[PDB]
Amino acid sequence: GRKKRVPYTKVQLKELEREYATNKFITKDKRRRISATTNLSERQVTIWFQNRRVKEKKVINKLKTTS
DNA sequence: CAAATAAAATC
DNA sequence: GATTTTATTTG
């Protein structure tokens, strides 16, 4: 546990981290691959990529134990 | 495309 | 209420 709000599909996040770790961002042909697998509309696939950038920032902020 | 705060949702 | 995780957002 140890979490607040719930996320979407673990498969989506997993593949998101996968492609993200490959470089940072990918082409439309690659995003479409993820979209077809997550049943997304392509557009939101690119949004989640940007969201991943703030995700890591949140982790670094938590790794402080100042509260 | 990128950094992200709002914002909802769980606690 | 606090944290966390996405959508709306402008550069």
Domain ranges of chain A: 1-67
A4 touches strand B (CB under 7 A): yes
Tell the residue number behind the tokens 């997304």, with chain if given.
A40
The number of helix segments (H) and strand segments (E) in chain A equals: 3, 0
- Closest listed residue to residue A46, CA positions, set A38, A58, A5, A9: A38
Q: Which residues of chain A (14-53) touch nucleic strand B at CB < 7 A?
A: 24-25, 46-47, 50-51, 53
A21 and A27 in contact (C-beta within 8 Å)?
no
Supply A29's token pair. Answer: 């042909």
Protein residues contacting strand C, judged by Cβ under 7 Å: A 3-8, 13, 44, 47-48, 50-51, 54-55, 58, 62, 67
CATH no. for A1-67:
1.10.10.60
Rounded to a whole number of angstroms, the CA Rg of chain A reads 13
A47 and A12 in contact (C-beta within 8 Å)?
no
DSSP string for residues in chain A: ---SS--S-HHHHHHHHHHHHHSS---HHHHHHHHHHHT--SHHHHHHHHHHHHHHHHHHHHTT---
CA–CA distance, A19 with A16 (Å, rounded to integer): 6
A45 and A31 in contact (C-beta within 8 Å)?
yes
